[PDB]
């Protein structure tokens, strides 16, 4: 029900604000920035990714 | 050599390479091909994302291999 991304790769925080994860890590998807990058929750963690990093199993309502 | 380059897509197209290719050029190859700055764009191959400055010989990239090429957008 809640909407989840797969982190289809490894994406390593370079910059302040990046969410980090590793390649199979299941991110709690809650929100869109723009249209390349993701706001999402990992292990309590809050942050930004790429949208073209990972997968979308649930998508947003649209 | 070739190798397949996936942007963001299923499927990968292939692209004649040789020993000596920077991953450079081979993200130049989308660039033009995608209009999108060279600068902004990284290879990702195995779970691993390849470094500008990397070549063919200097890395597990073989033939018949394939790679995710995309722009990743930078914050600053």
């Known amino acids: 029900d809640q909407p989840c991304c797969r982190a289809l790769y490894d994406f390593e925080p370079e910059n302040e604000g990046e969410l980090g994860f590793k390649e199979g890590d299941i991110i709690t998807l809650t929100n869109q920035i723009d249209e390349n990058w993701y706001e999402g929750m990992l292990h309590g963690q809050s942050g930004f990714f790429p949208i073209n990093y990972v997968e979308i199993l649930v998508a947003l309502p649209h | ?76």
């Open chain 2, 1 to 76: 050599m070739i190798v397949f380059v996936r942007f963001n897509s299923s499927y990968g197209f292939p692209v004649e390479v040789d020993s000596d290719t920077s991953i450079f050029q081979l993200k130049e190859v989308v660039a033009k091909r995608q209009g999108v700055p060279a600068d902004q764009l990284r290879v990702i191959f195995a779970g691993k994302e390849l470094q500008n400055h990397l070549t063919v010989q200097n890395c597990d990239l073989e033939q018949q291999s394939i790679v995710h090429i995309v722009q990743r957008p930078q914050r600053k």
